[PDB]
């Protein structure tokens, strides 16, 4: 069988050896096409470094697809990858780190897919948590970080269509594209009454927001804050501003390790290529250049997407949504305990919530 190039790009320290091992199911591609995998190390995660690295790869070698993992909390990495994906029409999987942090409104032409939960799924996991503990009275805080509308909408849709006595008291929209010298954000947060607050924003934004919220007495006992995966981010990095008792939905590498993720990435791209080749007797030619994409564009498309989203491997459904998220991730509910360590306190699995505690111990 013919070989397709797949770059695996790794930012920050990782066991390359352990990674190359999990892919020894390389004897486990019996498809129309076999992966030629190339581990590539990257040091930097600015836009230039990321663009030039991937474009250099694409020019030196024929790359059908990119598997990308990093060890940062930089959600902009996903945005950069979607952009590159759409411009070059190359499959990119963001499987770990900033690269997997929710990127809402991916480009029409994007072939960028992320491990981890959609926004709407996390919204619903939050309401399920709140329902378990009969916390029916709550407020929402977001920034303008993309997705915040989908988050608020999904909450609102859910609660207005149920007979549970939900009370959404207040929705705050914080503008952190301007400086906060007039104490605007303090003044907005001072409005908050509810004993539950849902917060949608980035990890960096949450760091400032919590600092302010502390100053006006909103983080102690009596207030429980609940945040999505990207706010917890890398759970070994805990800002001092984060309040103990913070709850988060998480997909940071708990049971689904990087080696297994890289292997599933390679499988997804390889299976998709085989499926397309089987049906159409071609696959898309790898772009030889980033820098010629304007010419070459009537000759390219995102055809491979239809297949990229519908892969099963070793009898596991690795489907993506059309919005570019994992379909059925096993989510982990985590709590920031008194030692400022994140602690497993429940699972979301088979669209069902199983929580460790029936009553919350003090935090």
């Amino acid at each position: 069988p013919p070989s397709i190039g797949i770059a695996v790009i790794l930012v920050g320290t990782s066991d390359e050896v352990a990674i190359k091992d999990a892919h020894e199911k390389d004897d486990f591609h019996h498809l129309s096409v076999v992966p030629r995998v190339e581990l590539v190390a990257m040091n930097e995660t600015d836009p230039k470094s990321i663009i030039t690295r991937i474009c250099d790869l694409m020019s030196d070698r024929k790359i059908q697809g990119v598997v990308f993992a990093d060890d940062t909390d930089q959600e902009a990495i996903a945005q950069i990858l979607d952009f590159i994906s759409a411009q070059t029409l190359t499959p990119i999987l963001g499987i770990h780190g900033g690269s997997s942090m929710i990127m809402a409104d991916k480009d029409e032409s994007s072939m960028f897919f992320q491990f981890g939960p959609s926004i709407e799924q996390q919204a619903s996991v939050m309401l399920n948590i709140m329902e378990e503990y009969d916390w029916y009275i709550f407020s929402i805080v977001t920034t303008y970080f993309p997705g915040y509308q989908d988050f608020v909408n999904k909450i609102r849709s859910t609660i207005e269509n149920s007979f549970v006595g939900w009370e959404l008291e207040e929705v705050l929209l914080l503008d952190m594209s301007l400086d906060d010298g007039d104490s605007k954000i303090q003044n907005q947060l001072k409005k908050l009454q509810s004993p539950i607050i849902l917060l949608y924003c980035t990890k960096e934004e949450a760091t400032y927001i919590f600092e302010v919220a502390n100053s006006v007495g909103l983080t102690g006992y009596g207030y429980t804050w609940i945040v999505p995966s990207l706010v917890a981010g890398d759970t070994d990095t805990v800002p001092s501003e984060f309040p103990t008792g913070l709850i988060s939905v998480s997909y940071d590498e708990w049971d689904y390790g990087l080696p297994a993720r890289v292997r599933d990435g390679i499988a997804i791209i390889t299976t998709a290529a085989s499926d397309m080749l089987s049906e159409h007797s071609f696959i898309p030619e790898p772009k030889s250049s980033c820098y010629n994409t304007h010419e070459k564009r009537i000759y390219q498309s995102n055809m491979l997407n239809r297949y990229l989203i519908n892969v099963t491997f070793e009898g596991r459904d690795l489907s993506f949504s059309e919005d570019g998220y994992q379909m059925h991730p096993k989510l982990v509910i985590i709590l920031l305990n008194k030692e400022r360590k994140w602690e497993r306190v429940g699972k979301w699995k088979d669209k069902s919530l199983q929580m460790k505690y029936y009553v919350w111990p003090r935090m």
Binding site: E44, I51, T52, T88, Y144, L178, G181
Partner: protein
């Protein structure tokens, strides 16, 4: 020896680069520049979006620009790569000529101002016309895309904060026969029709409307600028009224005003304490410019009364306020100016309006 503060620009031609240079040199003469002195750094547009992003890093951000002016090239090449790359560091981008409403969306373009208004702000002029000519019942037809819906949202906000929209009809962009949509409008009593649509979509509307005899006496048609440009003009019904943004395509005029505004803002910025320099280059740099959000606020709240393009302020989306429009009326198949919107007020000139039919 003053501190040198670089301003960046991505512009259409070398001529416009030279105009940028000279505007910055004038700003330095005008202002007191013992402490702070501006330096122009510029390129022209790259042929694709990835090259363009790379050049923003290599040519502009390497020079530690505090802001970047961007023109819309008149050749598929948008400000967007420049907004993205600068926005990554919270370096403000000033759009000079881009009119698309999507650049008003803070979630996508989180440090973007412009000295021209988005197409959707043409609703502000429609509203004043509706009061002036006492059109108290209108039908609004818009394309079901972002631009169309932005026009709707803007007009509805003005109407819901007098005249009323008796109905709103949306249609799918690229639909060629629109008889079903327009028959729906024909059924209604109101006969003032307002349209938001791209060139080609306006063309399709005009054609279908003609075949349904909806372009003659009794009807008023009120549109913006795209809908009397290019092919849209070619099939537009006589008596139509539309708009042209005065100086809207004059890159040179907007370079002048933008530089004046940015120079004023930079001197104001450096009155304050604890101003930091932007990052030098992209490589290895992933933190935001800590002073970026403050400089954005100072720009947002800048006023420049004596601009080439009129009175320059920005609204809460960073969009130009007090923009001036020609009010155009298609008579005997010539676009004729029948007035202006001077930024806050309608001024009818001594040319008579001719309506559909009469």
């Amino acid at each position: 020896d003053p501190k040198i503060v670089n301003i960046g620009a991505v512009l259409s031609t070398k001529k416009h680069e030279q105009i940028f240079r000279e505007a910055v040199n004038q700003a330095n003469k005008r202002h007191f520049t013992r402490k702070i002195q501006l330096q122009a750094t510029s390129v022209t547009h790259r042929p694709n979006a990835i090259q363009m992003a790379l050049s923003v890093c290599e040519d502009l951000i390497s020079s530690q620009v505090y802001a970047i002016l961007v023109s819309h090239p008149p050749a598929h090449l948008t400000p967007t790569p420049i907004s993205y790359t600068a926005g990554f560091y919270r370096i403000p981008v000033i759009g000079l000529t881009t009119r698309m409403s999507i650049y008003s969306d803070k979630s996508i373009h989180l440090s973007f101002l412009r000295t021209v208004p988005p197409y959707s702000h043409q609703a502000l002029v429609w509203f004043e016309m509706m009061r002036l000519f006492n059109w108290n019942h209108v039908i609004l037809i818009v394309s079901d895309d972002h631009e169309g819906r932005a026009a709707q949202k803007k007009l509805e906000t003005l109407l819901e904060g007098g005249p009323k929209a008796d109905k709103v009809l949306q249609f799918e962009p690229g639909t060629k026969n629109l008889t079903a949509l327009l028959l729906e409008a024909k059924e209604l009593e109101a006969r003032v029709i307002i349209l938001s649509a791209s060139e080609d979509d306006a063309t399709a509307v005009y054609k279908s409307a003609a075949m349904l005899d909806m372009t003659g006496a009794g009807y008023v048609w009120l549109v913006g600028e795209r809908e009397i440009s290019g092919s849209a003009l070619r099939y537009a019904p006589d008596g139509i009224i539309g708009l042209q943004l005065i100086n809207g395509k004059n890159e040179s005029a907007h370079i002048s005003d933008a530089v004046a505004v940015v120079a004023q803002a930079i001197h104001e910025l450096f009155e304050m304490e604890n101003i930091t320099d932007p990052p030098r280059g992209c490589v290895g740099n992933t933190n935001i410019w800590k002073t970026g959000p403050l400089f954005k606020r100072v720009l947002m709240s800048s006023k420049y009364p004596d601009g080439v393009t009129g009175r320059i302020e920005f609204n809460e989306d960073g969009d130009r306020k007090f923009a001036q429009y020609s009010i155009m009326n298609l008579q005997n198949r010539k676009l004729v100016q029948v007035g202006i919107f001077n930024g806050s007020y309608i001024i009818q000139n001594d040319r008579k309006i001719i309506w559909p039919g009469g």
